[PDB]
Structure formats: C-alpha cells, structure tokens
Amino acid sequence: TSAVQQKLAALEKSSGGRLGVALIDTADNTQVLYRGDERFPMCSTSKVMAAAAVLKQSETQKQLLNQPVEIKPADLVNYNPIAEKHVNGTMTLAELSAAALQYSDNTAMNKLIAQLGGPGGVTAFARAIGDETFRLDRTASTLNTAIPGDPRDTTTPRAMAQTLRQLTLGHALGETQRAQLVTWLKGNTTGAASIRAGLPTSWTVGDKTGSGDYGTTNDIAVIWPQGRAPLVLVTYFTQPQQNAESRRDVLASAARIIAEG
C-alpha cells in the first residue's frame, strides 16, 4: 500500500461514500488505483465517449461537424441550458458537441446518440478502441439514476482513465479530431470545484464532470503540468443515500492527494 492510497482511503472514510480513482503517469506509465476495478455510474462523464464517436465519423465525412441538426420542442428533456436557446431552429454537430461537453447539455447529448444510432452506437465505439468495460444503455434524461449495483451506464476508473488517454493523448482519433476534443475539454465550464480545485494553478486541465442521484459526483480530466509528462486522472464518487448532496470537494481533495505525491 503506497502512501497515497492510505490518504484516499482516509478521505473516503471521512466522506461517508464510495471513492474511485485512477491515475496514469505517462512518464513511467505507472498507475495509482483506488477501487480501480469497481463499477461506478458514469453520469455525464459518458458525454466524452459519444462526442469522440461523432468525431470519429467525421474522419470519413469531412463536413459532418458542420451539419445542421434541428432542435424541436419535443427534443427538450431534463436539463438543456444551450439547446433550448435554439428551439425551432438548428445547431451544428460541432455546436452540439461543444454543448454536451462544456455545459453538460442533455439534449445535445441525445442528438449525439441519435447520430450514432442509439446508445449501442456509443458502446460500440468503446469496444472499437479496446474499451470492453464501458457500457451505455440509456439516453441522457435517465442515464444518471446511479442506482447502486445497477450495471447500466457504468465503467471502472481503470478503464475510463486508459480510454481518456487514448482519445486525447494517444491516437484513437485523427489529429484534427484529437486536438478538437482537447479544445472542447479545455473550455469546460462545469469543473471549477472539482478536479481543477485540487491542482496547482499553473496547470492546464481539460475535464468533464458528471452528477446524478445518490450524491454521485464524477470528474475525468487530462492534465498538463509545466515541464513534465501529462497526466490522466479519473475521480468517481457515489454515496449511500438517494437524496445525498453533491460532494465536489471530495474530487478536489482526491486530486490534491494524488498531486501531493
């Protein structure tokens, strides 16, 4: 047991919930895992997978990101800050992908799903790039029920960390695709209190947050310090009571403990 895993263990005990962390230090390709193979509800962290899948399709249909998609009142779901600005109008698949990743728009997520042919189209792209753990089964308005023990819409920290590495650092996507996912993640507006809050302010972070019932509080991030090999960090958190408040502070503390070592 390394010192870091004693600190996250104490953090988890302090929190009252269940913590899951996966770190990948690409320098020595070493990993730090805490509940790295346990299953966690992804919530809106699933949005990275589907946007990466649309960009993949963009690798043969060069103008797909420019394609306009109608947004209609029937399309509004549970939480749609951006798309309901364009009801009875259009958004491009580029603007839909930015909306899902940077504001956690659920209608933008659902348009990404429809473009891939259903949730099985998102899960398919996971298997295509070696991810045999990711599974997406529901659309946006119900995928975040975060029911304990429910296998729907889950993955492990170890699996999501390696996948995020392949999408932004490796070559799962073409270079214009891989760079474009990075610009999206670097302009996320929802992760100030999460992973970003536990890291030195001299670091650049692209991140994607997720939340749901049972106090589920998630964040997945790619981090570039200033003069060392980049990092991939995944922090998953969920709690016993269905009505639990969100605990974004636990994600920053986990990042803080990780970066402290």
Both structure tokens of 188? 């996320």
- DSSP characters over 1-17: --HHHHHHHHHHHHHTS
Give the span between the Cα atoms of 115 and 60, in whole angstroms. Answer: 14
If we measure between CA atoms, which residue out of 158, 155, 185, 236 comes closest to residue 51?
Answer: 185
Burial class (CB in 10 A: 0-12, 13-18, 19+), 2: exposed
What residues contact 142, with CB distance under 8 A and at least 6 apart? none
The Cα angle at residue 236 between residues 199 and 156, in degrees rounded to 5: 125
Alpha helices by DSSP H, 89-146: 93-103, 106-116, 119-128
Both structure tokens of 246? 């969100």
From the candidates 2, 14, 15, 44, give the one annotated as an active-site residue.
44
Alpha helices by DSSP H, the chain: 3-15, 46-57, 93-103, 106-116, 119-128, 157-168, 175-186, 248-260
Helix, strand or coil, per DSSP, at residue 135: strand
If we measure between CA atoms, which residue out of 194, 241, 224, 200 comes closest to residue 21?
Answer: 194
When computed from its CA atoms, the radius of gyration of the chain, rounded to whole angstroms, is: 17
Give the span between the Cα atoms of 19 and 105, in whole angstroms. Answer: 25
Report residue 220: phi and psi, to 5°. Answer: -130, 135
The CATH homologous superfamily for domain 1-261 is DD-peptidase/beta-lactamase superfamily (3.40.710.10)
* Contact in structure between 217 and 19 (CB atoms under 8 Å): no
Give the span between the Cα atoms of 92 and 66, in whole angstroms. Answer: 5
Give the span between the Cα atoms of 115 and 112, in whole angstroms. Answer: 5
Report residue 43: phi and psi, to 5°. Answer: 55, -140
Please give the DSSP secondary-structure letter assigned to residue 28. T
**Strands, sheet with 217-224, edge to edge from the N-terminal-most edge strand:** 30-34, 18-25, 231-238, 217-224, 204-211
Give the span between the Cα atoms of 161 and 154, in whole angstroms. Answer: 13
* Contact in structure between 136 and 43 (CB atoms under 8 Å): no
Tokens 């263990």 belong to 9
Alpha helices by DSSP H, 117-247: 119-128, 157-168, 175-186
Both structure tokens of 209? 């947050």
Q: Beta strand 154-155 with 68-71: parallel, antiparallel or unpaired?
A: unpaired
Give the span between the Cα atoms of 210 and 207, in whole angstroms. Answer: 10
b/e map of 149-171 (b: 16 or more CB within 10 Å)?
A: eeebbbbbbbbbbbbbbbbbbee
- 248 strand-pairing partners: none
194 is catalytic: no
Dihedral sign for Cα atoms in the order 135, 137, 140, 143 = negative
